[PDB]
Design a protein around this nucleic acid. Structure first.
Ligand SMILES: [Zn+2]
Ligand SMILES: [Zn+2]
Lengths: 151, 154
DNA sequence: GCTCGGCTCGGA
DNA sequence: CGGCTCGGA
């Protein structure tokens, strides 16, 4: 079970959000090489500003583990987390975040800002990028009607 | 057409903050107002629901999106009893609200001018105004007994 | 109709 | 009660 193996599962959930006319982003929560949470974007269909892929995966992980704090967990998302999504990882105290393509415009994981690696914060989450970034950019490109070169 | 003040809506957010205090949670309350009309209510429910996103401001934003049938809430004002965190402040940018009114400041991990300022960060698509110091004396009394701290920290 | 506008939902 | 803004604050 490599990072690309778990990313292939997150890409499957991202296709479900694409069929629901949402942002094609998928997220899966892994703890000790096992899935504990799944999530995909459902903001437009559910009228929820927090119905992102990573939030729904974090919401599901807290229910199965019966604890809103998920220590030493690794989340596999297809997009760079936003300020809202990155803030939930600090509250969940997860271990590592693996995203594919970077949001060079409003990214909160080292692009526009870096809240996951802030010194004044109480928790530090490691970041790993470039995992299956070719297949993650192809979905977001057709959604925003953008070329694959901006990624 | 009646216009209420910031302290009037803050007194309602203090009522919801007592509900989170009774649920053994962080005594924080939040209420969403649009054109002097309540569209969302929220208090901390992270421990009871096992939800890392069950904060006071998030649950109030989830209620506003359901009543308005739109995850974007323009020209809306949120009345919270605590300084919003990085997660809550990021949700306000996604909801495109107009103004956030909080009571006491989180001098440690505040995201509304303390540790960071994401509502007034350059390069973002939306800018939300912040109003502070509204009924901060009564908001600190609830969080003080929760964290077992004196009133001199806030 | 002649691959929408300007670009990381349509207040991107 | 510990030590500070849940108990890994
Ligand atoms: Zn996000
Ligand atoms: Zn918060």
């Amino acid at each position: 079970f490599s990072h690309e193996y778990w990313m292939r599962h997150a890409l499957t959930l991202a296709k479900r959000a694409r069929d629901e006319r949402e942002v094609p982003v998928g997220a899966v929560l892994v703890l000790n090489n096992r899935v504990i949470g799944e999530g995909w974007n459902r903001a437009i269909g559910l009228h929820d500003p927090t119905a992102h892929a990573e939030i729904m995966a974090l919401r599901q992980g807290g229910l199965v583990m019966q604890n809103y704090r998920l220590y030493d967990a690794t989340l596999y998302s297809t997009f760079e987390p936003c300020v809202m999504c990155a803030g939930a990882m600090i509250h969940s105290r997860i271990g590592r975040v693996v995203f594919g393509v970077r949001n060079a415009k409003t990214g909160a994981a080292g692009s526009l800002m870096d809240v996951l690696h802030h010194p004044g914060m109480n928790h530090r989450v490691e970041i790993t990028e470039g995992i299956l970034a070719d297949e993650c950019a192809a979905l977001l490109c057709r959604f925003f009607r953008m070329p694959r070169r901006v990624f």
